[PDB]
Write a protein that binds this DNA or RNA. Structure first.
Ligand SMILES: [Zn+2]
Ligand SMILES: [Zn+2]
Ligand SMILES: [Zn+2]
Length: 87
DNA sequence: GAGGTGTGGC
DNA sequence: GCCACACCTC
């Protein structure tokens, strides 16, 4: 039940929220509103969370620490898969 | 691990 | 719109 349809070149992809469609439309337009501000870096991204992932390459930030060993991860889904190895 | 992206509470 | 969740593919 998706009411927000993409009307670009007969794409037809449909989403549940308008903000989802607006983000998808960037695949057709090449718009990248989220700019890395790291010194000397000119990378830009269509989604804010893609920029977050990029910043963690600059900072080495790994917020998701495994509570059963010393390993840490930049993303929760990486940790979740690793945790299965403990059980 | 990384890239891409569909989803939904707020 | 922000943000992280969740899943697929490589
Ligand atoms: Zn489209
Ligand atoms: Zn950067
Ligand atoms: Zn572990």
């Amino acid at each position: 039940t998706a009411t927000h349809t993409c009307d670009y070149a007969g794409c037809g992809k449909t989403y549940t929220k308008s903000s989802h469609l607006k983000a998808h439309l960037r695949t057709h337009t090449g718009e990248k509103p989220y700019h890395c501000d790291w010194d000397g870096c000119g990378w830009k991204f269509a989604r804010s969370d893609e920029l977050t992932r990029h910043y963690r390459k600059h900072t080495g930030h790994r917020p998701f620490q495994c509570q059963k060993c010393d390993r840490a991860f930049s993303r929760s889904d990486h940790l979740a898969l690793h945790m299965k190895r403990h059980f």
